[PDB]
């Protein structure tokens, strides 16, 4: 029925969040890296031509 | 001199092909430098955010 109030008289443990000294987070990774499908396609065309269509 | 013309034009195929290969080498190398710069920027962000964390330790500590 009654409630214990010492934990209220103090900082009741394990309630919401407790912090230490966490550091060095580093945020996140990256969304891949600049992709070059366009240039790869174009250079493939260039080599194909320079080999077979450039006798 | 048909052979001379063929040799001169063959030099053009050589000029364009090595020129194009070099364009890819320079563009590909620059991109790697930019990626390394991004990595260094990430490291700097991590360091400054750690400094912000350390200041937080003392700040919230005083509040408590």
Curated annotation (Swiss-Prot), chain A:
Coiled coil: none annotated. Disulfide bonds: none annotated. It is found in: Virion; Host periplasm. Belongs to the T7virus internal virion protein gp15 family. Component of the cylindrical core that assembles on the inner surface of the capsid during capsid formation and plays a role in viral DNA ejection into the host cell. The inner core is composed of stacked rings of gp14, gp15 and gp16 proteins. Following binding to the host cell surface, the internal core is disassembled and gp15 is ejected along with gp14 and gp16 into the infected cell. Gp15 probably remains associated with gp16. Homooctamer. Interacts with gp16; after ejection the gp15-gp16 complex composed of a gp15 octamer and a gp16 tetramer probably binds both the viral DNA and the host inner membrane. Interacts with gp14. This is Internal virion protein gp15. It comes from Escherichia phage T7 (Bacteriophage T7). The lineage of its organism: Viruses, Duplodnaviria, Heunggongvirae, Uroviricota, Caudoviricetes. The chain holds residues 1 to 55 of 747 of the full protein.
Curated annotation (Swiss-Prot), chain B:
It is found in: Virion; Host cell outer membrane. This is Internal virion protein gp14. It comes from Escherichia phage T7 (Bacteriophage T7). Interacts with the portal protein. Interacts with gp15. Belongs to the T7virus internal virion protein gp14 family. Coiled coil: none annotated. The lineage of its organism: Viruses, Duplodnaviria, Heunggongvirae, Uroviricota, Caudoviricetes. Component of the cylindrical core that assembles on the inner surface of the capsid during capsid formation and plays a role in viral DNA ejection into the host cell. The inner core is composed of stacked rings of gp14, gp15 and gp16 proteins. Following binding to the host cell surface, the internal core is disassembled and gp14 is ejected along with gp15 and gp16 into the infected cell. May form a simple channel spanning the outer membrane.
């Amino acid at each position: 029925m009654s409630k214990i109030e010492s934990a209220l008289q103090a900082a009741q443990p394990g309630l919401s969040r407790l912090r230490g000294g966490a550091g060095g987070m580093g945020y996140r990774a990256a969304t891949t890296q600049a992709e070059q499908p366009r240039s790869s396609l174009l250079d493939t065309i260039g080599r194909f031509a320079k080999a077979g269509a450039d006798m | 001199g048909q052979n001379a013309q063929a040799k001169m034009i063959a030099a053009q195929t050589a000029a364009g092909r090595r020129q194009a290969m070099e364009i890819m080498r320079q563009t590909n190398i620059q991109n790697a430098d930019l990626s390394l710069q991004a990595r260094s920027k990430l490291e700097e962000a991590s360091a400054e955010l750690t400094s912000q964390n350390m200041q937080k330790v003392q700040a919230i500590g005083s509040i408590r």
